[PDB]
Amino acid sequence: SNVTGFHTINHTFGNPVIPFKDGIYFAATEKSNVVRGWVFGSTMNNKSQSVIIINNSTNVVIRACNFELCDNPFFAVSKPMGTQTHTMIFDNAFNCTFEYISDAFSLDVSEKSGNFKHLREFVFKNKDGFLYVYKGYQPIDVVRDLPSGFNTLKPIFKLPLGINITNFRAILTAFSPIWGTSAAAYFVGYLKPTTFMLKYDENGTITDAVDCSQNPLAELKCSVKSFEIDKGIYQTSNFRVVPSGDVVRLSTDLIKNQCVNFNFNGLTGTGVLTPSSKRFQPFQQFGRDVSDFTDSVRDPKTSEILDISPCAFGGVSVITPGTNASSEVAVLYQDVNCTDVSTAIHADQLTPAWRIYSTGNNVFQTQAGCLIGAEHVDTSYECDIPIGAGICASYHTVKSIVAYTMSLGADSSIAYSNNTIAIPTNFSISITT
Amino acid sequence: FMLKYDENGTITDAVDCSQNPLAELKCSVKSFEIDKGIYQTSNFRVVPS
Amino acid sequence: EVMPVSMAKTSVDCNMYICGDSTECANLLLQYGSFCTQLNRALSGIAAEQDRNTREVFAQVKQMYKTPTLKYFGGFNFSQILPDPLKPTKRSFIEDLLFNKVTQYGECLGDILICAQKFNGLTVLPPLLTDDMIAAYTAALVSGTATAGWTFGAGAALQIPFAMQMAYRFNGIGVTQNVLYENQKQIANQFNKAISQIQESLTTTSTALGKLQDVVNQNAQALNTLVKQLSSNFGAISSVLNDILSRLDPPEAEVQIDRLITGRLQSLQTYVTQQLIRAAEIRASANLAATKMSECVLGQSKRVDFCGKGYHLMSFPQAAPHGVVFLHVTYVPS
Amino acid sequence: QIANQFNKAISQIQESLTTTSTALGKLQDVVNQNAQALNTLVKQLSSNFGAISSVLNDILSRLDPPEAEVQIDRLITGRLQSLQTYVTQQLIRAAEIRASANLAATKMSECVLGQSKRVDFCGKGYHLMSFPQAAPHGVVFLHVTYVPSQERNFTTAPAICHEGKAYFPREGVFVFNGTSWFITQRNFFSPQIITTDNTFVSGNCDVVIGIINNTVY
Ligand SMILES: *[C@@H]1O[C@H](CO)[C@@H](O[C@@H]2O[C@H](CO)[C@@H](O[C@@H]3O[C@H](CO)[C@@H](O)[C@H](O)[C@@H]3O)[C@H](O)[C@H]2NC(C)=O)[C@H](O)[C@H]1NC(C)=O
Ligand SMILES: *[C@@H]1O[C@H](CO)[C@@H](O[C@@H]2O[C@H](CO)[C@@H](O)[C@H](O)[C@H]2NC(C)=O)[C@H](O)[C@H]1NC(C)=O
Ligand SMILES: *[C@@H]1O[C@H](CO)[C@@H](O[C@@H]2O[C@H](CO)[C@@H](O)[C@H](O)[C@H]2NC(C)=O)[C@H](O)[C@H]1NC(C)=O
Ligand SMILES: *[C@@H]1O[C@H](CO)[C@@H](O[C@@H]2O[C@H](CO)[C@@H](O)[C@H](O)[C@H]2NC(C)=O)[C@H](O)[C@H]1NC(C)=O
Ligand SMILES: *[C@@H]1O[C@H](CO)[C@@H](O)[C@H](O)[C@H]1NC(C)=O
Ligand SMILES: *[C@@H]1O[C@H](CO)[C@@H](O)[C@H](O)[C@H]1NC(C)=O
Ligand SMILES: *[C@@H]1O[C@H](CO)[C@@H](O)[C@H](O)[C@H]1NC(C)=O
Ligand SMILES: *[C@@H]1O[C@H](CO)[C@@H](O)[C@H](O)[C@H]1NC(C)=O
Ligand SMILES: *[C@@H]1O[C@H](CO)[C@@H](O)[C@H](O)[C@H]1NC(C)=O
Ligand SMILES: *[C@@H]1O[C@H](CO)[C@@H](O)[C@H](O)[C@H]1NC(C)=O
């Protein structure tokens, strides 16, 4: 996911009001411990309650009060001294609701040379009046941005603050020889309500994870509950097309050949509207199928006879050569017109939707449905992975996933003659299980 | 009654399900045409007096 | 002898069946767990067995033998058992009769199409082997028997003239070889008339393929009952979820919607259980047809009343909707 | 030759059972279907079935004993019907194992304890003998079969005319070597001299189609 990078560099002193919204992921590359604290609250004024969690180089100080908040909250360290001189977060406090101070220690505040050596990683969450604080750490050696990798974060605080946090402000440290900066960077990502599959080893340590909504391969792993998946075709979660439109006959125009949410005089539902030739009698308001479902309607404004198809639905199957062979997969949208599937993918109308996923301009319609991702090869081999109606798929050199029509067997011939017999002249012994 | 509608939505024929045992059979099978056999249909009760 | 080997294979979407695009209904389904995962697993397991049943019967030979152009093998006329290339059907003349005597849900019809869907969640999937592939396996089993015999199936196919093949099979039933060669004119004529009497029965009359029709009719009754349960109320205010939402406050609306869920979710569980029982019966018949093909087409049986009545000489498969038809040539003394 | 072809064919099976997999896929499927059935029955304990909680203690703690009795009774029928479903499907699956266990009892008596003449029963080829091996929840049969090979074309005939009489083979076929006529069997080529010991005398010549002028010893 896309994270937003901020800077503590020559004239850049990034401590603005950054929205929180759900919970944030905070990370910081440090060599001089510029990032010290955070101000959490809604209005950032003394009119309501806010909390400040700062490392003041002596203690970790957590206070949830009505604070006379600075519009520029910071610490300050003198460059020729190498020591902290200023503590300007708020000036005064009253009506405190929570306070906690950790153990004392002595913090390296001076400006350091070299590259960034330390990555501190925090996660902040709001739940039932608690501020959840998670802490991880990774040694780094970088001159620049966030490094790629996997590292778990352990909890360190459950703070019963009871305050409404919708915004936050990072507290930087100003280094001046009179304000200034030194090289540091801090990153903000946003947390989303999603599903992961976590793997715990024998010690109860999380060693690996899979985001179930990243791409079709990962959704398959969450379904099987396995990081390793053998070759085959695998049924997974159903897809739906979401309607886009509203036809009411207030009164609106009539949208045709598009999944809309319609409301005729007494008939509601979602579906696709299209003209038809069902010969209604002049006293027949709408029609029904061989079941008890409305499938047609006489337009109450212009008397046009319309059909109502269901919107679209079906199953999703993921075709894979195995995770031992590759990590590309093909998808089958079962029993659906490829015009509806391709258009609703591009206009982002499908449920489920995957982030890292694209059509790839290989859309091929079989009787089993729409096959997306595999190439159509005009020859015939043995059936490897069966799809249906004479069409199989496999992983061949062209490697990629290909789709083709099956071969039945070797093409041979027996000459018929009225006076010739074939007789064998040797033999073999064979053992079969 | 069991009503038969053709392709135009016009009622062309009907069967009264309580006229006789043959018609009650047609309502059960849902068919105007019935082949040779024995066919299970609705239970009977004796009403007390 | 008429034997069904496979069953129509179906799939159900729960959310189209149980709810029918109702969002309040969709939320209450989560309180039941992953019922729809196990209903999709059980129905997809039945569908894969239906493809395994069809492969085990027909795909018993490794080589596809080209249909010979000579179809009159020493007086025995095989033109109604092998496909005629002059008429573009790729089926024999007996299969054309079989495919015309056996003859609500979502289905995609056509050739490579009209993929139409219904407001219930019910759909029927296409099988792996199409009809044109089945008729190519049957024409390889007939033309292999006509030119190679036993060795067609139990090894590499050996060429043999047809009358010398019939002489061996007469020898195998206890009748010595000269009975064939001194009476080829009688035996070729009795063979040719007995094929024509079967062809007449498959145009004149019916009920010979009643076992294949029963497979079709049992699948229709099971789907029609599951559809009809959508109309039931199960004690609730209405069978329509919109009328529950319109007429009732959201506390009792939640109770009446939850009442229709367990009514519909248990009708769905009943359908899955009985399809699973019926799939066990088709495996029993599809395993027997795989035994009658290897031991009787690809060989010569000595089991009495296995492979028709009389002393078994040879046997010819024909394809049918969801089944096989074996034509058993037997010897009757008199 | 036959002892060496037998000894190499055992060693090729032993290699397949160390090198590769999926030969015992039917035994693994029996194991995996029993795991899915138990794991689903366990997972139904976590369902609420519309009640307040899936945990009976939280129903007792949070609710008065009138509605506690209703919410507990709601979880009973939810759990008691998941249990009835498991029993019904184990009972259906046990009918399928009897079908496979009765076939294995037929393949042991008719094929290990005897010699089968049914084609494609007991492996492909002409069945010679067969050896059982045990497996988890199953059997493994090793079928030793005979496969003929190295075919050769010959000219043949149904009968031979000698001194006005038609002579038929009693067993086998007449073949033409390229120089002279012999009688042989069909599963192996071993030519022999056509004498009256192995040759059936019946009918006159010029009656059947394809009689060869030759002499019969
Ligand atoms: C082997 O048996 C088949 C049995 O079908 C014999 O073929 C049939 O022969 C008759 C007359 O020879 C054909 O009837 C004619 O058909 C044409 C075509 O429409 C029609 O215009 C004529 O009025 C007449 O009815 C019949 O169609 C034909 N059947 C087929 C399938 O071709 C065949 O002769 C026998 N083989 C030998 C070598 O005797
Ligand atoms: C789980 O953690 C334990 C720590 O208790 C690890 O056990 C130690 O392993 C080392 C070898 O690296 C041994 O020398 C120690 O004697 C072990 N300690 C104890 C208390 O048994 C264990 O290796 C960890 N497991 C994994 C998979 O990393
Ligand atoms: C019958 O076939 C077998 C195998 O195909 C032949 O035996 C082989 O003979 C060669 C000698 O050239 C040996 O090197 C091989 O090891 C033998 N194979 C086995 C499996 O033992 C045999 O010669 C053939 N006999 C005839 C008459 O064709
Ligand atoms: C159903 O009604 C339609 C009327 O629209 C009939 O269709 C007409 O049939 C005549 C033949 O009798 C044709 O000449 C017309 O062209 C048709 N009209 C249209 C608009 O197609 C139809 O025959 C009726 N069906 C039945 C079974 O009576
Ligand atoms: C993240 O941003 C980049 C451009 O900075 C863009 O190309 C990419 O699609 C974005 N990722 C997602 C998941 O939107
Ligand atoms: C898909 O829909 C279009 C309508 O725009 C139709 O022309 C096409 O034939 C449909 N394809 C299938 C396979 O039904
Ligand atoms: C036997 O004759 C056929 C000709 O129909 C030929 O193709 C085949 O190769 C011959 N067999 C051998 C062993 O040469
Ligand atoms: C068959 O013919 C070959 C040469 O044509 C000859 O060498 C051989 O001896 C003959 N077979 C027998 C059994 O005599
Ligand atoms: C076999 O057919 C040939 C022509 O291919 C013919 O000359 C010969 O007479 C026939 N023989 C028999 C016995 O049918
Ligand atoms: C076989 O010999 C007889 C004479 O004994 C003769 O009449 C007949 O034509 C011969 N047949 C052939 C095929 O040469």
Numbering used by the authors:
A (entry chain C): 64 to 240, 244 to 315, 515 to 663, 672 to 706
B (entry chain A): 262 to 310
C (entry chain A): 707 to 809, 818 to 826, 831 to 1052
D (entry chain C): 904 to 1120
From the paper:
SARS-CoV makes use of its S1 RBD to bind to the human angiotensin-converting enzyme 2 (ACE2) as its host receptor. Here, we have used single-particle cryo-EM to determine structures of prefusion stabilized SARS-CoV S 2P ectodomain in uncleaved, S1/S2 cleaved and ACE2-bound states.
The S1 NTD and some of the S1 RBD, while clearly present, appear poorly resolved in the cryo-EM maps, precluding a de novo build of these regions. Although the overall structures of SARS-CoV S are similar, we were able to build several S2 protein regions excluded from the wild-type SARS-CoV S models, including a fusion-peptide-adjacent region as well as additional amino acids in the S2 C-terminal connector domain. Whereas most other coronaviruses possess two short α-helices with a cross-linking disulfide bond, in SARS-CoV a similar disulfide bond bridges the two strands of a beta-hairpin. The unique SARS-CoV S conformation of FP2 and the lack of cross-group sequence conservation beyond the disulfide bond in this region suggest that SARS-CoV may use a distinct mechanism of FP2 membrane insertion. In both the wild-type15,22 and 2P unbound structures, the central helix presents as an α-helix in each protomer of the trimer.
